């Protein structure tokens, strides 16, 4: 917009602030795991598997603590 002076303010914090994950892919089918707060971390355990996921941002888009993407069958909602 050239030289608009707006003062930068992302006034949002989420309309998500949970994430719901679950055991499938398939809306019908996914078997609900827990819920995780947005902004930490959480431990699902699946399969008997321990995933320590983090909650990073408001689609839930699921990154575990040391870079690793989430498994297909491990669906998250944000919530």
Not at 15 to 30: E, I, K, N, S
């Amino acid at each position: 917009s050239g030289r608009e002076n707006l003062y930068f303010q992302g006034h949002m914090a989420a309309p998500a602030r949970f994430c719901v994950y679950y055991d499938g892919h398939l809306p019908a089918t996914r078997v609900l795991l827990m819920y995780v707060r947005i902004g930490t971390t959480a431990t699902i355990t699946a399969r008997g598997h321990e995933f320590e996921v983090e909650a990073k941002d408001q689609n839930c888009k699921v990154i575990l603590t040391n870079g690793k993407q989430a498994p297909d069958w491990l669906a998250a909602e944000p919530y």
